[PDB]
Design a protein around this ligand. Structure first.
Ligand SMILES: NC(=O)c1ccc[n+]([C@@H]2O[C@H](COP(=O)([O-])OP(=O)(O)OC[C@H]3O[C@@H](n4cnc5c(N)ncnc54)[C@H](O)[C@@H]3O)[C@@H](O)[C@H]2O)c1
Ligand SMILES: NC(=O)c1ccc[n+]([C@@H]2O[C@H](COP(=O)([O-])OP(=O)(O)OC[C@H]3O[C@@H](n4cnc5c(N)ncnc54)[C@H](O)[C@@H]3O)[C@@H](O)[C@H]2O)c1
Ligand SMILES: [Cl-]
Ligand SMILES: [Zn+2]
Ligand SMILES: [Zn+2]
Ligand SMILES: [Zn+2]
Ligand SMILES: [Zn+2]
Lengths: 374, 374
């Protein structure tokens, strides 16, 4: 079969920043102990991957990006007990090692074995597994799903329902579990709330579904692209507004609308001005503002600490607050039970070879999520 | 009998910034509808008062400062149903109007009628009640307790216990409520956790007490004044640190000491530099940092949003999140029920006439709380 042998397949490699992806043949070494090689069936295009092309998030190049995916277990290394070949699995971009301080706290999820903070670009043992033209190729968040086969650590992989529709379910890998857990787990939206969500992409639009599920009485959706509004309405927004229509700042407009500010505001975009506008617009004495978007490297916000003393809560979180390995299995089971649907978010399905066409649909706001099939 | 008209008494008026107080004769008009005129037994010098002297906190001048206090009710105005003459009372620096958005929400306590926000220096109906030399004098935070008599709004007064030692219990009116409540209500310190408290003043040592009441397993006290450590220890701090003994930044020292950071950090001082060190030293994936101190007017912090994205919660609160008319009696009842002792915090009891001396003690660092009696 292919077990124990080096595979040679196609993969999209980013050799330089602001350059297109090159689909090239690469060699994928076999799984060492406690690692798993997976065969990718579908991958979503998330904006974090774009942040590396653009140059906003620094990671060592050349690299194979990608992290929102679903596929089948091709082989397991020595010791892997949690999954067997043939199993359907989702690769997780934040490991749940189960043994660190973070993993043992019932409420923390940014495990210490992650590669998000200070990116090495390897797997958890410090070594890479992709070669292309003799050159060693770097990993990304220890998942690198823009390849036909990838090797991930065992604690970064979830085994999900064998009957799962893999080209729907890959969204639970990042975009959806993030969007919805922001509302339900991080901010902890209460029935009757008033919430604002800035940014209506695949992750922003799942924060709307999170608030609706929470029983929020009013969801205001903010975006400069008015074509996203119909979907936001369809998914739960009570109203959608576009900043460019007004002459006064969007935080003043929202305070004027909500009797002095919302109860919960979420920033799902990644830029400084919207994070500030999102703090300023929650109510001064009972609001919580949650940061979900990822900022450009080394950018600072000037905050007036008096903004916090009156009673505000400012906080952020990775992956919607989900412990990755326990969290994702259950969220896929709820999908099966028809507890929530994921169809409205997928607006385009393309073969993996068209990855660049997929990134261009994101750059024009023609797409919410584009799925790439292998 | 005075019930009915103007009283002439002594009060310390501050007519200019950085100029000493002057105990002068002022006239206190009788209480209007829903107001109360109180006879002052004892007042605590809190550092909020000195921020107005210095100019760090602005409010309209001339003014009679003071807010930490207890007295006996002389006459209540028409319509007053909560208190009656002869009752022991504590004026609250933050009203609990019972009817606004904030007041209706079970979490929030910063009532909308407060004068902390934008200071007018009047009572809730827009007018002043004091005169001195043919000129009207302003109120401070609607309480103005550095006067033998003062007039307050009914929703800013609490009826405490008849047998209450008004020279001890006056601390509950600000210092104790603030610091203890921060630990037990805003941060919500968990049994077994590890807290750090920056600032060992009157409010700061009350935070040490709350962290021990919530069950924090390690309470690290930070102060550049070594003479405060003994009391910190006495009250609960498992260890005391002085940032000048180090050649490395205090937040670094602290992370190295706690496996990457503290669970709960508190800044009870008011400098921007220490607010920064208090965010940085709590653990990036599970720590909560709380601002208690009041910052110098109009200064800004430059922070990186990534400090929050990993898992940090940053917040502020006033009155340790206690809702003032209901909370303050509950605490006095627990004091009377021998649940805690306010003894260690009082270090000097001077007669009111020596108020300028009490401010000097503060300014030299020899006092935790100085109580002025009438
Ligand atoms: N914290 C996490 O775990 C986590 C996980 C995944 C993604 N993210 C980050 O969160 C964000 C999610 O974005 P996405 O993946 O859903 O894609 P996205 O690019 O489709 O979302 C951006 C959306 O915000 C809108 N927008 C752009 N500028 C705007 C402005 N000035 N005001 C209002 N709206 C504006 C765009 O029109 C688009 O609708 C990204 O920043 C991604 O980097 C964070
Ligand atoms: N938010 C509120 O509800 C509320 C209520 C009461 C007081 N306060 C504020 O809390 C703060 C302090 O209260 P307090 O009454 O106990 O005052 P305080 O002056 O007695 O306490 C300040 C402490 O900080 C220490 N300190 C000063 N500079 C330091 C530095 N650079 N590093 C470390 N330690 C240093 C001082 O030695 C002193 O012990 C003040 O800012 C007051 O305005 C706020
Ligand atoms: Cl007047
Ligand atoms: Zn993503
Ligand atoms: Zn871990
Ligand atoms: Zn109120
Ligand atoms: Zn005070």
């Amino acid at each position: 079969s292919t077990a124990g042998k080096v595979i040679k397949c196609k993969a999209a490699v980013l050799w330089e920043v602001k350059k297109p992806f090159s689909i090239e043949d690469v060699e994928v070494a076999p799984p060492k102990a406690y690692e798993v090689r997976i065969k990718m069936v579908a991958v979503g295009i998330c904006r974090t991957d774009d942040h590396v092309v653009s140059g906003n998030l620094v990671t060592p190049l050349p690299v194979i990006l990608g992290h929102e995916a679903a596929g089948i277990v091709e082989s397991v290394g020595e010791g892997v007990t949690t999954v067997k070949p043939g199993d359907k699995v989702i690769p997780l971009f934040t490991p749940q090692c189960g043994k660190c301080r973070v993993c043992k706290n019932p409420e923390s999820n940014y495990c210490l074995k992650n590669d998000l903070g200070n990116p090495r670009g390897t797997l958890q043992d410090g070594t890479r597994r992709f070669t292309c033209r003799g050159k060693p190729i770097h990993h990304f968040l220890g998942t690198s799903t823009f390849s036909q086969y990838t090797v991930v650590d065992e604690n970064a992989v979830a085994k999900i329902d064998a009957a799962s529709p893999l080209e729907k379910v890959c969204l639970i890998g990042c975009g959806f579990s993030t969007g919805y857990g922001s509302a339900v787990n991080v901010a902890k939206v209460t029935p009757g709330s008033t919430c604002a969500v800035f940014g209506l992409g695949g992750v922003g639009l799942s924060a709307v579904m999170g608030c609706k599920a929470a029983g929020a009485a009013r969801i205001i959706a903010v975006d400069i692209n008015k074509d996203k509004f119909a979907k936001a309405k369809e998914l739960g927004a009570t109203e959608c507004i576009n900043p460019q229509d007004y002459k006064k700042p969007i935080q003043e407009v929202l305070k004027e609308m909500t009797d002095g500010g919302v109860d919960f505001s979420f920033e799902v975009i990644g830029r400084l001005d919207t994070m500030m506008a999102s703090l300023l617009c929650c109510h001064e004495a009972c609001g919580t503002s949650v940061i979900v978007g990822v900022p450009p490297a080394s950018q600072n916000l000037s905050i007036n600490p008096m903004l916090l003393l009156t009673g505000r809560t400012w906080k952020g979180a990775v992956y919607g607050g989900f412990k990755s390995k326990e969290g994702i299995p259950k969220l896929v089971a709820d999908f099966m039970a028809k507890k929530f649907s994921l169809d409205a978010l997928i607006t385009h399905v393309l073969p993996f070879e068209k990855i660049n066409e997929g990134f261009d649909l994101l750059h024009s706001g023609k797409s919410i999520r584009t799925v790439l099939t292998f």
